[PDB]
Structure formats: structure tokens, C-alpha cells
Amino acid sequence: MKTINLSIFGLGNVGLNLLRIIRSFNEENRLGLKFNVVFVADSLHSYYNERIDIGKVISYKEKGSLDSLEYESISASEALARDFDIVVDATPASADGKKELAFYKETFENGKDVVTANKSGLANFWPEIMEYARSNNRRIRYEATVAGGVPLFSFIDYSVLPSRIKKFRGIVSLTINYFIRELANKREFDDVLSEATKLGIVNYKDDLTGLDAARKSVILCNHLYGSSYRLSDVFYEGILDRSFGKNERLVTETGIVNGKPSAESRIKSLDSNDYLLTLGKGSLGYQLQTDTNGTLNVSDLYDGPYETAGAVMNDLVILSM
């Protein structure tokens, strides 16, 4: 009954599952919403139509066959100037966040909101993105940038409204924690890495230096405390010679320390009854300590891109409803 129009940038693990979800949601939902797609782009294609056939785009991407499509081809900038409501950024994260910054600037100025799974602009240029949003009276949500499909920003925004002090501890970076836990099994780094490569588990540098965790901690700290931090404002460390205990994890923590928001990702030996120790190697989870709503433990069972796309979709519904 209410139609919301989208331009989707990126058709990979997240983007392609988002298309599948949008299709099912359109057919099934009890929210009175319909999401129409007017534009899809990947690294090779940039297709516009008043009513993109989503099933066709899915089927042709699955067959490696978007080459075969009839649609208008227009550049990202032209697409932002066409009539629609929301941009979805499911593209690769740049090293410096500049491309994401420029893209959100142009999106906002063209009068559209942003939902992003890409953390790069937010981790490097948060106050600039927020200024461009405010300036243009637009909004951005970023559920999927931290803790994938486990509700986190919607949880903070709608479930614990009365709490003022919130403090966060979590496993939000899985690959480095996989490596730590395997090394704690008394395996050699080279053997863990070799197998992880064959399994598709891991250029693994950003993960294993703790930088992935650091980028997420910027977004989390800024959202929680209204800080305007970038990467240099947070602490992080990684694993790139020593042995690891069974109770060691790279834990990401944010809170107010000495009157100042603080964010850190550190390798710690946890107490044997710590909630975070209970999480499986594929499980994202966190403990959120609040002053009015107690201390809450939240996690999923198995992280994956379908659930991640489901977080993007929750943001899309929040913005629309």
C-alpha cells in the first residue's frame, strides 16, 4: 500500500540476498509496505528502470549474465538524480572512506536517504557524513556495519530508550577471533591460515591487525555517546609471536571513561564464566550494561550474509514505516 523506491549499489553476498529478501517481503509482509527497485549497480553494470524486475536481476546475476539486460545504463551520479527514496550501499569498503563520503554527500544533496552495510565512510568521516545529512535534512542507518544481522543499533534506539549510561562489550570481529581460538588449540599460524584460505574463511591484514574491529568501534562509540571520533581516537591491536589461552578473545569495548567516550579492541583472557566466552566461532554477540534497563546479553547463532541483508532490510523498514 505504501511504495518505497530504492537504488541498490552492490549485488554481492549482501546485495544479492537483499534482492531476494525484498522479493519475499513484498509478497508476504503485514506492514502495508512495498519496496520497488529502480536501479541496481555492480562493478560491471549500472541499470535503471522505473520498475526493475528483481527476479530477473537475481536470476541473471546467479547465471553470471547481467550482460544480457536491456535496461537504461546511467552513471551512479545520474542515478542519484532520478526520482527514488533510499540508496542502499552494499559496495566494497574503501581503505580511506573518501569514496563513501562523496557518495553519501551526493545522495543527500539529491534528497535521498542512505542505508549502508559498508563501514568505511562512517569509520573515517562520521562528522562529515552527519553534517551533510543534517544540512540536507536526510537520514542514514547502518545496522549491518557492526555485528552483522544481530540487532544492535535498532536495539539501542528502540529497546533501551530510558537508559543514559550505556557501556558495551562484544565479539564483533569474527575472523581474528577465529585465528586466536585456533591458535589456542596449539596450531601453527601458517597451518591455520592455509586451511582458512581453502575454507574461504579469509588479503587478511585488516582483520588480523584488529583494524576491522577498530572501524566498527568508531561507529559504535559515536552512535552510543554522540562523539565524532575517527580511527585515530580508538585503540586496537591484533595478532600479527606468542601462544594464546583458551579464554582469550579480541573484545571490543566502549564506555565513558574519565568523562570521555572511550573505545578499545583488545586481546583479553576472559573469566571462565564471561558471557562472551559462550559464543561459538560463527556467533556475534554483546553485553550491553545500562543504568535503567539492566545488563542485556544479545547474540545470534551463526553469522552470515543473508542475516546481514536482513539487518539492511530492518533499517529500510524503520526509515519507511
Add this chain to the structure above:
Amino acid sequence: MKTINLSIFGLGNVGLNLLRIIRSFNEENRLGLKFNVVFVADSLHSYYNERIDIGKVISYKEKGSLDSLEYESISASEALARDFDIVVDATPASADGKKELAFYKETFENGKDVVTANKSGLANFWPEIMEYARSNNRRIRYEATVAGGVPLFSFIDYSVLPSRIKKFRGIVSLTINYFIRELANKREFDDVLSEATKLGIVNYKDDLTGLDAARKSVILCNHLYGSSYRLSDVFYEGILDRSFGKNERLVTETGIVNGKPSAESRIKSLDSNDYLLTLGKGSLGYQLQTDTNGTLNVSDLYDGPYETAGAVMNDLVILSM
């Protein structure tokens, strides 16, 4: 900056902590909200004022000294007819739900919304309460009726919007589970009960027959599936002669079974790695399996009335923001 006016019915473990929270929230919040209280009632007092002094009401209730107050005394019905926005029901749960039904009817017809921690009207007269709300274009929220201060209805309503099949399993009834676990320690019923009484842990009939769980399951199932069930539509059981295993809990489950919403509270021996087995005796928690947002585990560490009042307060903010 935006002022919302409340009438608070009940000044006990929940009600009195709600007053304390409202005071701190008014002083501290970054949401641009202020909650003003125009009316408070307990079993002895029914005080109205354009601007009730909350600190005074707290201090006089703590001293057992509301007798000493100057304010207008008016009946609940007169209070509902005065100008305000929301009624908070933090009163005792009736056996049959009729008093709660009549009270919400009069609240809605007088043009005010309801936030309730009392489960009784909802467990017995859900479709009637919902019809009276719809009829009068009013709203009711009930976060605190099931799983206390652990976000549950706000979680469903704002964090997993895209998911259609949701299925729920949880420990939502703590006292019966306390008794089960103590009995699993090879103690005698009479000794558990005697100690529990001295400790203030437990007329314990509704808890130990599983009826408390059953009432909560009605509310949960109706919220999840849009059913209009009452107590006779759900299954439940209790402990009121045999021995109990270490892995037995009274688990409350809801889901679609054979195309029909189903809700059951049953004593089950859980598999040793079940999430629900990880919860402490003071911990409410649940696992929510969804088709678009994965399977989510959520719990608190220690249930209590302050956190429960914090759930009431989250409902108040949702209704107002």
C-alpha cells in the same frame, strides 16, 4: 521540550521505581521529552494535581506517609476524565481480568493510551481490549507483562521487522523454575518452600501450577501471530510427586504448528548445550528464531522491579516519541 502527562496507578515495587526513573529521566534525557505526573493512586490514596511533586510522593511513600498529602482526592473514573496523555497500570493482577478490562475501556473512551505491567486483562480479554483500543483510536503497550525488563515486544516490533515466521522459546516464569532447579538439587518440596518464604522468593499457586507462564504465553502468542487467544487456548503444566533432572526447565514456546498459532509451557529436559540452560536462576531470556534475521538469543543477568519499571518507561518513550 515536549511534555507528556501521566496518571500512575500503583506505587509498589514497579510503580515506585517508575516514579524514581521518571525523575532521573526528566533531569537527564537527550530525547527532548519531559514526563509530568498529574495523578497517583495506590490502594489507600488517589491524588490529583496539575503537577504532582514526584520527589514528594516518593519520599512520603518511602516513609509510609502519603496520609500527609494535600492534593485533590478524586476517584479513578474522575481521574480518567481529567486532561492527560497516558495511564500506567502498575496495579495487582486480578484473577479474571475483568477489572483491567473495564479500566482500559474507560481509559480509551476518555481518549488516553495505556501502558501496563499488569498481565491480567490481556491474558483474559485480549480481543476486547484491542477492540476498545481500535474503536477509540488509542494504543496500549505491555513490555513489562512478559520477561520483565528484557526487551521483547520492542525487540519484535523494531529489530526484526522483516521476518515473517518467528518462533519463540524462553524462560519467562522464574519462581516455578527456581523450585524445579532446587528440587533437582535433591531437596524436599517443603524445605524449598519454607526457605523461599523466609527469603521473600514466593499464595504461590499461580506460579507453581504454571498458570503465570500460561498468562504470559497468551500475550506473547497474540502479539506474535495476531491470534485472539485467551487462557483456554494455550497449554500449561506445573509441579504441584517425582524427582527432577538438572536439565529440566518450564519452557514457554510459541510458534505456528499445523498452520495454527500454538503456545505451550512445559517441563522439559533440555539438551546440555541449549541456550536456555545457561541462564541463572534470576535471569529471564529467550531464543527467537526468525526467517530473515536469524536466531537471536536475548537475556538479562538479574531480573528485578527497577528494570521492569525501566521496560514500562521504554513503552512510555515509544508512545511519545
